[PDB]
Amino acid sequence: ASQVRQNYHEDCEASINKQINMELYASYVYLSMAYYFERDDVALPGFAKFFKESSDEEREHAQTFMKYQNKRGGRIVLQQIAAPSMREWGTGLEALQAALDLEKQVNQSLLELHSTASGNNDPHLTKLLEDEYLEEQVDSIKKIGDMITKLKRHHHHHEYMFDKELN
Amino acid sequence: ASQVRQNYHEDCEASINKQINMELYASYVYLSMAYYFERDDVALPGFAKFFKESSDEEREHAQTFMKYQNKRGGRIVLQQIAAPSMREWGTGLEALQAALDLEKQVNQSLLELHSTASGNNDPHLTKLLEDEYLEEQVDSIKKIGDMITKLKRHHHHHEYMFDKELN
Amino acid sequence: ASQVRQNYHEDCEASINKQINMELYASYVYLSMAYYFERDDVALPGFAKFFKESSDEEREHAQTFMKYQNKRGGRIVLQQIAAPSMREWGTGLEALQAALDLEKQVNQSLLELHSTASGNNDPHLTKLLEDEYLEEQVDSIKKIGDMITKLKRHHHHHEYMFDKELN
Amino acid sequence: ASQVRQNYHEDCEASINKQINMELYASYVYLSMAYYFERDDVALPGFAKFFKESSDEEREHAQTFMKYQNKRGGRIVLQQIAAPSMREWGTGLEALQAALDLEKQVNQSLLELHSTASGNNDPHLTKLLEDEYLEEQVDSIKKIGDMITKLKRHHHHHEYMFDKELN
Amino acid sequence: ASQVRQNYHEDCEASINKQINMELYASYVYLSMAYYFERDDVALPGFAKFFKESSDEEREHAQTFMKYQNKRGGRIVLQQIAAPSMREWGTGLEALQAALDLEKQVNQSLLELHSTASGNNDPHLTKLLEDEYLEEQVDSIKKIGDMITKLKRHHHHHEYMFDKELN
Amino acid sequence: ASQVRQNYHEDCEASINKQINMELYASYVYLSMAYYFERDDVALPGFAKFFKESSDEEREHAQTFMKYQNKRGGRIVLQQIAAPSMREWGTGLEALQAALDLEKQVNQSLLELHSTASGNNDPHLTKLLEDEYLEEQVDSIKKIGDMITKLKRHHHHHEYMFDKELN
Ligand SMILES: [Fe+3]
Ligand SMILES: [Fe+3]
Ligand SMILES: [Fe+3]
Ligand SMILES: [Fe+3]
Ligand SMILES: [Fe+3]
């Protein structure tokens, strides 16, 4: 097949492609939140900046996978990008909680993919998953947990303040 | 309705969401091309750079329409980003010609959107389109226009030289 | 008539004079709000500074219409500038809702002046309105919208904190 | 009344409000003059700049009195600003001659305001009038008088050259 | 036709070619004027510089339309440029008065070109005319009108001094 | 006649006017070639830039003859400037061969104008031609000669590579 392919189980190839789809999806969800917090009846510019940056991050995570698909000799197969789970994410706190669930869903995929790599004996791919994904994931789950706990005090005045620290 | 809405027809609100979806789809297609030209058996960096920047432009375009939705009081309704036409894009000349076609398609939409805004008497929305999309569209079409003319000379040696000046 | 006059219908020359008055009127309201929020039983330097900038901007928007009148061969007719009806504006939130209302009035007049310009096939005047008035108006309307949503969060303690991040 | 008021007779307070209104009227006259001298059938940029500056001067003198009213514990009451006498100011020499009489008019009211101030033994407010208003007024009257004798000389050629160093 | 053409009615295309030819004719007239004012029996370097600049201005306006014709997919067809009316332009005031009528002439054709553009629903080409041609034209007509009234005053001494600050 | 005129035969004054036309004609050909090589079905920015510089240079060579006419006491007579016969110039190689032919025409006229100058014992005019025209002409002719020999090497692929080293 490919002149570069060496020790790349087609099960791993297919899991990178499905994982490329998910980072684009999470990129799309954070892009909804980012601009939801810029509506004139929401106006939380800190939550908007926080989710814009995550939307760009997740789109970079998908591109690192695409670069990797080629490095190892696989063929990128892009599926559809599902519409985000909501249109209106509610308060900042509700927004963060969907992100916390969404971050952990990506973690359970990334940990399943690492299990696929470890089983087909791919150390290059376990190296990629640990150094460029599993670390960032556990870090961004922790950052949000801190945020969620800080934002739980009901109050709208308390949220406008915590917003000022995200800017 | 929202506090800020004035002279903003609901037909226009709905076209701007249609347009956000086309812009994001166009960004998806140029991301497909971009990394298709980074495959080991394609190996054209100059082309891959061009479609990477095109895919950022289109993503930048769709965000300016989302800022616009919120600017006017409209409400972003995000839909599914369909998967690209193809997964393999051919020679650079075939991808260029595919880019020219998608650029002229998006231009039809932007000109259709303009007539919808003239019809409803939204001069703020026609000024958005004239100053930020129709100029970028016509310019981009002519740039792709020239590139197809320089790249039609057969040879793959001509493609590799031309590639080295996109780079 | 005028050596420079060309394609300038008299119903546009008169809408520009009425508009120069209206801009001078809005300038006068923001001036009254500006020093109202500097009284010692009010003491809101962020609101005061905001409405001070807005008086200045609404004055310069009047002087741009006067430069334009002279530029086309028109003849400026200045009339009396009304005092605001109610100079006791209340809280910063009640003053902003009056700002939003007034900012939407001026937009309405500026849009009519444009429909007057388009019906007389004056592409110079429709361009003056699109660039220098309709854009600032929708922006100002959206920025005030955000402020009101933020400010209604009730408490004077919220207004004080909101005021400090307006300075 | 107020918690800052001390030795601020209400006849003083009333005749600051009156003076605010006069200063804004003068700002209006000079602004009328300023843009008159930019008519294409007048075309003296020196006088235009001169009166455009006096318009700013006088609007600032109004705000200094508005600041003073709050600083003392009186309440600002703004009034309708009258439209200027003319909206066609004639030659440059006539316009100066009008301005001289308006600056002599504003001087008379500032001396009356001072008389009211002393009779009521308000040394704070006579210092304000002497340092901020009465002294601008005499050099302003002397500057305008110097210009009038410089310009007396008939000729449009001599007004064109005077206008060159006013610029 | 072309591979870039989209929404470019051929009546627009024809009346850009016509306009190219008009702009080059104006470049020629002002160039005639420019070097006339350097005859040793005329000797006004201010007017020479002024029209020598307008000659450059207008030649650039031609090339912007030639660029526009290629950008849109029409074909440039150049025509013989007519010789100027005079080759002896008289006094400075007469030359301005000729220029005013030529700039008013070029304005009439640009508005017609705009009318053709809108009737055909080409928003790309009306934006071009408004941002690049119609607005240069009004200040140009206003600049030339200001000069004419400044120069009306008989005297060769007064033309010699006007000429000094045109330089 | 003229206060400055001295040793300027009328048959030289007329050859200079005919030459000012011819230079304006050559300027017009290079302008047409310049934007011809910018059409999207041609796409040669090196040739376009070359012939753009050559239009500009042939225009300034016209303005130097006009300065000279005035310098000697002559009287500029401007006539119509012909359009090129064929604006579809073909390949860059066919356009250059037409450039060489035209550049040799102007040399021929410039040499005749010199023989006219020498026969009338006008050492000023023969010096103007030797320094400012005959030198640039032989240089331009030789530079184009080199280009043609290089360009005829047939292939469009050679022309594209040649064009890039002309930019
Ligand atoms: Fe991720
Ligand atoms: Fe786009
Ligand atoms: Fe305004
Ligand atoms: Fe004053
Ligand atoms: Fe022009």
Ligand SMILES: [Fe+3]
């Ligand atoms: Fe030449």
Ligand code: NI
């Ligand atoms: Ni608090």
Ligand code: NI
């Ligand atoms: Ni509480």
Ligand code: NI
């Ligand atoms: Ni005299």
Ligand code: NI
């Ligand atoms: Ni004199």
Ligand code: NI
């Ligand atoms: Ni070969």
